Design a protein around this nucleic acid. Structure first.
Lengths: 142, 38, 173, 59, 208
RNA sequence: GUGAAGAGGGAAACAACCCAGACCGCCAGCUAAGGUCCCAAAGUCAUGGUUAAGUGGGAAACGAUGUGGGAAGGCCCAGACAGCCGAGUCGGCCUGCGCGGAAGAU
RNA sequence: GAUGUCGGCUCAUCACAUCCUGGGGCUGAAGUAGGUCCCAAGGGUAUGGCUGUUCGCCAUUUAAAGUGGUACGCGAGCUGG
RNA sequence: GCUGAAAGCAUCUAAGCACGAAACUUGCCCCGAGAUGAGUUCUCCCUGACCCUUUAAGGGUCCUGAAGGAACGUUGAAGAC
């Protein structure tokens, strides 16, 4: 015999919805990344995608501990000489709330084409409403 | 203000207080006694 | 601790309402409201208020003491009130009141106009003296400090705006 | 690969991989990881029976 | 507030009774006709669209004809857009004339500047020339050095080099309004503005 | 003792450091150094303590009512300390973990 | 079995132990004008006589004529004292 | 700086509240949906018959050729092409 392998043309996927109100950022990101990769199904295969679709609501109400709300800094560079720029957690929540969860989740996924494709199944919203009622998602409590 | 590494009371009206992570000396009799650790 | 173990008497004519951590005190001079820390418990025995720590917090007694002092000040304010007095020293310095605005002349190339907040009253029983009246200790103190900051007392002659009962040291050249 | 699949199957029945292996060792079962993964994918009633055996041994 | 679209005629001067000469640019502003109103519910912002001029029938394609016929206006030589401030209303088919500037004092003018083509660093960036004598060898108007040694070992982004010059969008701010003539559709402003004779201009009230 | 003339696992990468000496095949099992939230295989294990500095994840002489533990002292219901009447308050010693001193060139 | 070494010209880019402009505390700070320490890198920051000079002295200006790293920046970009 | 306990006093701080610079984020000017996360709005054009086969986002024959675009010519205050 030979060991079983999944096939991208015959996998099954499902839709879930999650609420981020009062949750801890990193401890929520671990679960999101686990379920996007597909490490909770017995059919897991490293070179195939076997995850689920997840909607995240209320992204502007996620929590941090200690003095991090004013002391965590996000950096980036623009490509021009001298172009190093930064922002704080409060500033980020004020102008682009969804990027906070997006960056954390992207850091915990594999690097490469398959990881980039895994990232596409995440849908993040800052309020309490979405427009995906035709997919009939089920509630997931994390 | 005197900024230095060793700060201490110089007379009986001096007081030691801690404000926002810094050690300071404030005096009610002599303005020359005002000190900050740094 | 010691401060927090002394209860607050609630005299006749003052209404006390408690809702979770919000307290409202009403009296002849007005109404005041405040929200307290989540590590203090306040009880209304019969005519007294008592304060105590809650189990699960490591700084209960300090918070209890602060809350006690604040509530006592509220009760005094809603029956008697608070007043402050300011004095002007110098040549050509003057003050006046119109409505809820104070006009000050203090040796500048432009006049100073100050707008009072809601709940504070002012009077000028002389061109060189101001009296403020109110029912909020913090607000009255802040207004007095803002007024004083326009020209602070100076060390060679004493000129400026001062509190009535303040000592101003002087020196020579 | 075999170990990862076994972990996924066991946590859906309510136990972790390490406790599962310990329980099988105490119950004197000698099935290896290849066969356990095969059964995990192709026959789930049998895998539930094995998990019950391990839990009874650990109790 | 909104602005208007005009055409550049040329330059002249005005003599005052006190003995002063003012150099002026003449701008012709015909009637601007409203073609579309965009609101918040349908588009997400508040603006109007305008046309001006004339165009021959055998050069207007069918899509353009249908768009103009929905509004009920004659075809012009282009379409432009202006953003609206709170408290402003307009309707489709309305006309706007130069009398909008009857009480404005200063304006901003926008146009497309003249073309010079491929240009060197002396003309494009004000570099200095090297010696014309004293033994120079084929290096008179050349740029010189463009970097450092092994550290960093590349050329930085934004470096100043030779290339295309002119033929782009430019704005000049805070120009005096000298005259408004409604009988002849003329606006006279003080100073020079970008472009060549016969090009299109956009005129707005000043922002500063 | 190792490399030279030595492959495999750990220390991000890293001849000479730690574990260990490759005759050939296998889609079997147990362990060493080192490890078990996700990148990435395995405890979001159990019981009692300490830290609030992101210390952990760079550095001294020296300075300070940060705060956990231990053994002795002076005063005090015959009224102590502070301020202007009613239970505690003073200063040394030994020891655990933190704070300042702490400025560099894509 | 080769990585061209001082000075000048053209073109620059970063640090902060800050020369000017901005904000403060103490003064043996009356005012004008000064001394010393703390915060701050947005922008700005001479022309000539002598000498191969980098430096340096002298003449006359300026709010000011900062200190350092980049193969003591830069010859498949120029010169050759 | 205001109000305020631990520490019956005092204390800008531990809980609360107010000021404060050419440095930071905006306000001014230019590029910008290859933003593969490839967005929105207005208008315009196309309304025939059959056959085969391994039966499906299948292959072929006849009739039809729109909105628009490109090519050519006379050329520009646009331009190395």
């Amino acid at each position: 015999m030979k060991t079983f392998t999944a096939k991208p043309e015959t996998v099954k996927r499902d839709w879930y919805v999650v609420d981020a109100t009062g949750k801890t950022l990193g401890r929520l990101a671990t679960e999101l990344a686990r379920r996007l990769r597909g490490k909770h199904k017995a059919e897991y295969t490293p070179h195939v995608d076997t995850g689920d679709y997840i909607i995240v609501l209320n992204a502007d109400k996620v929590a941090v501990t200690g003095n991090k709300r004013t002391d965590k800094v996000y950096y980036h560079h623009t490509g021009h000489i001298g172009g190093i720029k930064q922002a704080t957690f409060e500033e980020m929540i004020a102008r682009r709330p969804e990027r906070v969860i997006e960056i954390a989740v992207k850091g915990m996924l594999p690097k490469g084409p398959l990881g980039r494709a895994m990232f596409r199944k995440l849908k993040v919203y800052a309020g309490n409403e979405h427009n995906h009622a035709a997919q009939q998602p089920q509630v997931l409590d994390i | 203000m005197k900024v230095r590494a060793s700060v201490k009371k110089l007379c009986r009206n001096c007081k030691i207080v801690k404000r926002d992570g810094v050690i300071r000396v404030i005096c009610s009799a002599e303005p020359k006694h005002k000190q900050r650790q740094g | 601790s010691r401060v927090a173990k002394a209860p607050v008497v609630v005299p006749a004519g003052v209404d006390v309402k408690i809702n979770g951590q919000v307290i409202t005190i009403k009296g002849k001079n007005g109404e005041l409201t405040r929200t307290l820390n989540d590590a203090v418990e306040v009880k209304h025995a019969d005519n007294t208020l008592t304060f105590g720590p809650r189990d699960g917090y490591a700084d209960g007694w300090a918070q209890a003491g602060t809350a006690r002092a604040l509530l006592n000040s509220m009760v005094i304010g809603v029956t008697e009130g608070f007043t402050k007095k300011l004095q002007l020293v110098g040549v050509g310095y003057r003050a006046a009141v119109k409505g809820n605005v104070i006009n000050l002349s203090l040796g500048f190339s432009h006049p100073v106009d100050h707008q009072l907040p809601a709940g504070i009253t002012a009077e000028c029983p002389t061109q060189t003296e101001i009296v403020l009246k109110g029912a909020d200790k913090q607000v009255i103190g802040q207004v007095a400090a803002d007024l004083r900051a326009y020209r602070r007392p100076e060390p060679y002659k004493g000129k400026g705006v001062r509190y009535a009962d303040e000592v101003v040291r002087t020196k020579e050249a | 690969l075999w170990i990862a699949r076994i972990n996924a199957a066991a946590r859906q029945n309510g136990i972790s991989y390490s406790k599962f292996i310990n329980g099988l060792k105490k119950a004197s079962v000698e099935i290896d990881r290849k066969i356990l993964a095969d059964i995990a994918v192709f026959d789930k009633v049998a895998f539930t029976a094995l998990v019950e055996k391990a839990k009874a041994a650990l109790a | 507030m909104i602005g208007l679209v005009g055409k550049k005629v040329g330059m002249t001067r005005i003599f005052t009774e006190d003995g002063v000469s003012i150099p002026v640019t003449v701008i012709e502003v015909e009637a601007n006709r409203v073609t579309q109103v965009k609101d918040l519910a349908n588009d997400g912002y508040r603006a109007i669209q305008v046309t001006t001029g004339a165009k021959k029938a055998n050069r207007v394609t069918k899509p353009e004809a249908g768009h103009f016929a929905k509004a009920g206006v004659e075809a012009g030589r282009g379409l432009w857009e202006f953003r609206l401030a709170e408290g402003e209303e307009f309707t489709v088919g309305q006309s706007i004339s130069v009398e909008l500037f009857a009480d404005v004092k200063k304006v901003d003018v926008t146009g497309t500047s003249k073309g010079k083509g491929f240009a060197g660093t002396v003309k494009r960036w004000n570099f200095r020339t090297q010696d014309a004598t004293h033994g120079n060898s084929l290096s008179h108007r050349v740029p010189g050095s463009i970097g450092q040694n092994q550290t960093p070992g590349k050329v930085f982004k934004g470096k100043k080099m030779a290339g295309q010059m002119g033929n782009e969008r430019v704005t000049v701010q805070s120009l005096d309004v000298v005259r408004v003539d409604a009988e002849r559709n003329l606006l006279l402003v003080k100073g020079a503005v970008p472009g060549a004779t016969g090009s299109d201009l956009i005129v707005k009230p000043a922002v500063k």
